[PDB]
Structure 1
Amino acid sequence: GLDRNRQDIGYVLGRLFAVLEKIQAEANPGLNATIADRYFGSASSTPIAVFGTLMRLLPHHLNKLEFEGRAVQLQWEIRQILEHCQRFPNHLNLEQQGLFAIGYYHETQFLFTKDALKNLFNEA
């Protein structure tokens, strides 16, 4: 249940936010306010607002990732997502509004399915 080549900017941004929070929640798993808890509200609606700051914020999570290769794992799928994101849309369309939540939970599943990211990375 993840269309890795969907190209729906809402869906690719949802996927991107899912991996962003996956990294944040693997950077420090004990986290009061993940970017879902603090950024999702606009990441789903105003991707330009956060997703700029979400990637100020991303390399530092990739650093904080304990398993230094896991950082490559997750950064690679950030790039895989962002190939489909020619631009962070100013305001997510309403279709795209919902598809962002779709993407968040699709890509979150893809990340929490056991071998998926580590596998799918190894076919690149």
Structure 2
Amino acid sequence: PYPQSLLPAVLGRIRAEHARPEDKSRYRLEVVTYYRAALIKAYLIRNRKLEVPVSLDPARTDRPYLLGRLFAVLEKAQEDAVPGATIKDRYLASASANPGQVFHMLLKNASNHTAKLRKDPERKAIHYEIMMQEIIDNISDFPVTMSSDEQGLFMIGYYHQRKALFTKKNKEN
């Protein structure tokens, strides 16, 4: 097995970092990078359970995974409504371990961001709020707390639903 402090290390490093592409030359401003996510995935596999290995399993329906995807689409709506330079106050640590007491305001701000979006001719867009309804559907209530392994599932789901929305894929001649 892996050490039982591998996952808390990657968790507490996800919290202690922030997007700053103006300081690094290699293009990556993500806080859940390919390596932190791959390492949390390996921990969850060889210590806990089998999880999604692929870009996104939208048929997953496990509350930590789903909440991670919801957080991902919220931050996508935010970064699409306002370019964000590229700074945003960090709630990933807060939402990963205490989803309710943060997701309430997160969803309200996401409503505001989709509003700012729809005010412009950028709505026929509108499938962000549709994705949010879809994800909230499978969720009976926002859980009070989440265990560290549930937090790792949260991070994996965030990474998945984050690469699902980006536009860079298979670029090699």
Fold match (TM-score > 0.5):
yes
- Which runs of no fewer than 5 residues in structure 1 stay unpaired? 115-124
Question: Greater Rg, structure 1 or structure 2?
Answer: 2
Pairing 1:1-124 to 2, within 5 Å after superposition: 1-30=55-84, 31-33=86-88, 37-65=89-117, 66=120, 67-70=122-125, 72-113=126-167
Aligned residue identity for 1:57: N
For 2:99 and 2:141, the matched residues in 1 are separated by 9
Q: Helix, strand or coil for the counterpart of 1:44?
A: helix
User: Root-mean-square deviation (CA), in Å?
Assistant: 1.6
Aligned residue identity for 1:7: T
State the Cα deviation string for residues 49-98 of structure 1 (Å, max 9, x = none). 2101111211100012241231x111111112112221111111332211
Structure ranking higher in helix proportion: 1
For 2:136 and 2:162, the matched residues in 1 are separated by 16
CA displacement at 1:113 relative to structure 2: 4.4
Count residues with an aligned counterpart. 110
Given the two structures, how large is their TM-score scaled by the length of structure 1? 0.80
CA displacement at 1:38 relative to structure 2: 1.6
For 1:86 and 1:5, the matched residues in 2 are separated by 17
Aligned residue identity for 2:144: N
Structure 1 segments of 4+ aligned residues over 3 angstroms from their partners: none
- Which runs of no fewer than 5 residues in structure 2 stay unpaired? 1-54, 169-173
Aligned residue identity for 2:123: E
State the Cα deviation string for residues 9-64 of structure 1 (Å, max 9, x = none). 1100000000000000001023421xxx4211111111012101111211100012
